[PDB]
């Protein structure tokens, strides 16, 4: 009964289970949006238990974000492992996952768990040639992981959750170590987090998304971000490529993963957004690598 | 920046 449903998904040991709220979750909780545009504070300990860190064995580097959905399965962006134009083509043995982390650089003794990958499953139809369509990969751990106060799975959405939550005006939440900030000409100061960060962004209407990029946007993608303007606290660019985009159901109080951080736009000063893979549309793919896979 | 992780994970 792996990711074919998971009972405890999205109820966080330190918040929901103790009837405790994080310092910003009410924002997700409006229905209307106009208003609290929170900046991108540091995460609270246990605020995001499903957060994963893809780690390059050697040279030891933080490759991307990822999310815990089972005790044996991790979800990321396929571009994190396979991207011909950049000679990117990772294998099982080239990475490790790191679950249970806050600090970006410390090994976190007695908290994090580092595991090996057994197999990587890229969607057969992911499109690196043009726009990164079907940017989803699944990694099955080399051995199951024990949930902790710090380590817990997020829920995968179902038809109705996707239907009611995925909507223009509704805030979602990204978390990550800011690997979406992969500059050159930059002089990244007041940055490169020490600790995991968090920001709540509003989902954007399809046409407004299409009309801000030159990229051909498909049905498998959504965009979120505040309106390039005067006061726009919160940046998409604040996450990690392959990391999680999540909403808290107002019906059942659980946390589901609605998107995977795909690319960001005008990640500099020009008012663009973040693009994410639409988890609900790719879900039957997921449904079956799992329901029928492992090695 | 990355602190070294146990030789046991490679
Ligand atoms: C990625 O590299 C593997 C060997 O690691 C190769 O078999 C595979 O075809 C490559 N994917 C491509 C070329 O897109």
How far does A294 lie from chain B, in Å, by closest CA? Answer: 21
- The three-point CA angle A233-A254-A248 to 5° equals 20
- The three-point CA angle A88-B1-A193 to 5° equals 85
Q: Please name the residue of chain A whose CA is at the shortest distance from the CA of residue B2.
A: A105
Report the C-alpha gap between A119 and A290 in whole angstroms: 11
Q: Please name the residue of chain A whose CA is at the shortest distance from the CA of residue B5.
A: A107
How far does A120 lie from chain B, in Å, by closest CA? Answer: 18
DSSP string across B1-10: ------GGG-
Tell the burial category of A219 from Cβ atoms under 10 Å away from its Cβ (0-12, 13-18, 19+): exposed
Domains and CATH numbers, chain A: 37-48+154-280 (2.40.10.10), 49-153+281-295 (2.40.10.10)
* CB contact B7 to A (< 8 Å): no
Non-local CB neighbours of A46 within 8 Å, separated by 6+ positions: A12, A13, A14, A15, A149, A150
Residue nearest to atom 4 of ligand 1 (CA): A89
Report the C-alpha gap between A241 and A267 in whole angstroms: 13
Joined tokens for residue A3: 């990711």
Task: For CA atoms A50, A54, A55, A57, give the dihedral sign.
Answer: positive
Joined tokens for residue A93: 């043995």
Joined tokens for residue A14: 């330190």
> Are the C-beta atoms of residues A126 and A80 closer than 8 Å to each other?
no
Method: X-ray
Helix/strand/coil (H/E/C) assignment for every residue in chain A: CCCCCCCCCCCCCCCCCCCCCCCCHHHHCCCCCCCCCCCCCECCCCCCCCEEEEEEECCEEEEEEEEECCCCEEEECHHHCEEHHHCEECCHHHEEEEECCCECCCCCCCCCEEEEEEEEEECCCCECCCCCECCCEEEEECCCCCCCCCCCCCECCCHHHHHHHCCCCCEEEEEECCCCCCCCCCCCCCCCCCECEEEEEEECCHHHHHCCCCCCCCCCEEEECCCCCCCCCCCHHHCCCCCEEEEECCCCCCEEEEEEEEEECCCCCCCCCEEEEEHHHHHHHHHHHHHHCCC
Q: For chain B, after which residues does the C atom lie more than 2.5 Å from the next written residue's N, i.e. where is it broken?
A: none
Non-local CB neighbours of A167 within 8 Å, separated by 6+ positions: A203
Task: Single out the catalytic residue among A79, A123, A152, A278.
Answer: A79
Report the C-alpha gap between A126 and A123 in whole angstroms: 5
Q: List C-alpha distances in Å: A280 to A13, A89, A164, A277, A286.
A: 25, 26, 12, 9, 10
Give resolution in angstroms. Answer: 2.0
Answer yes or no: A241 catalytic. Answer: yes
Ligand 1 near A84 CB (within 6 A)? yes
Instruction: Provide residues of A within 8 Å CB-CB of chain B.
Output: 57, 60-62, 96, 104-107, 114, 116
Tokens 């709220």 sit on residue: A21
Tokens 């107002």 sit on residue: A250
Residue nearest to atom 8 of ligand 1 (CA): A89
Residue nearest to atom 11 of ligand 1 (CA): A89
Whether the bond into A10 is cis, omega within 30 of 0:
no
For residue A57, the chain B residues in CB contact (below 8 A) are: 10
Nearest ligand 1 atom to the CA of A84 is: 14
Report the C-alpha gap between A62 and A182 in whole angstroms: 12
> Nearest 5°: phi and psi at A84?
-45, -50
> Are the C-beta atoms of residues A39 and A195 closer than 8 Å to each other?
no
The strand pairing partners of A268, in sequence order, are none
Nearest to A114 among B1, B3, B5 (CB): B5
Non-local CB neighbours of A53 within 8 Å, separated by 6+ positions: A62, A65, A66, A97, A98, A99, A101, A177
Report the C-alpha gap between A72 and A146 in whole angstroms: 9
How far does A72 lie from chain B, in Å, by closest CA? Answer: 17
For residue A104, the chain B residues in CB contact (below 8 A) are: 1
């Amino acid at each position: 009964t792996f990711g074919s449903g998971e009972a405890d998904c999205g109820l966080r040991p330190l918040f929901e289970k103790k009837s405790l709220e994080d310092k910003t979750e009410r924002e997700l909780l409006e229905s209307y949006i106009d208003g609290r545009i929170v900046e991108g504070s540091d995460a609270e300990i246990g605020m995001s238990p499903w957060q994963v860190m893809l780690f390059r064995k050697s040279p030891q580097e933080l490759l991307c974000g990822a999310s815990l959905i089972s005790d044996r399965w991790v979800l990321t962006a396929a571009h994190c492992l396979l991207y011909p134009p950049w000679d990117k083509n990772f294998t099982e043995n080239d990475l490790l996952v790191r679950i249970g982390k806050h600090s970006r650089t410390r090994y976190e003794r007695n908290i994090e768990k580092i595991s090996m990958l057994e197999k990587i499953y890229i969607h057969p139809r992911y499109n690196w040639r043009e726009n990164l369509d079907r940017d989803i990969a699944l990694m099955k751990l080399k051995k199951p992981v024990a949930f902790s106060d710090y380590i817990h799975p997020v829920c995968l959405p179902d038809r109705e959750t996707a239907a009611s939550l995925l909507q223009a005006g509704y805030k979602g939440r990204v978390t990550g170590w800011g690997n979406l900030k992969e500059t050159w000409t930059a002089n990244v100061g007041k940055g490169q987090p020490s600790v995991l960060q968090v920001v709540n962004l509003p989902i954007v209407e399809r046409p407004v998304c299409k009309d801000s990029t030159r990229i051909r946007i498909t049905d498998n993608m959504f965009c979120a971000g505040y309106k390039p303007d005067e006061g726009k606290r919160g940046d998409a660019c604040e996450g990690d490529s392959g990391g999680p985009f999540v909403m808290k159901s107002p019906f059942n109080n659980r946390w589901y993963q609605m998107g995977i951080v795909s690319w960001g736009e005008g990640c500099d000063r020009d008012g663009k957004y973040g693009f994410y893979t639409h988890v609900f549309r790719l879900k039957k793919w997921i449904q079956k690598v799992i329901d029928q896979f492992g090695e | 920046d990355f602190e070294e992780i146990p030789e046991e994970y490679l």
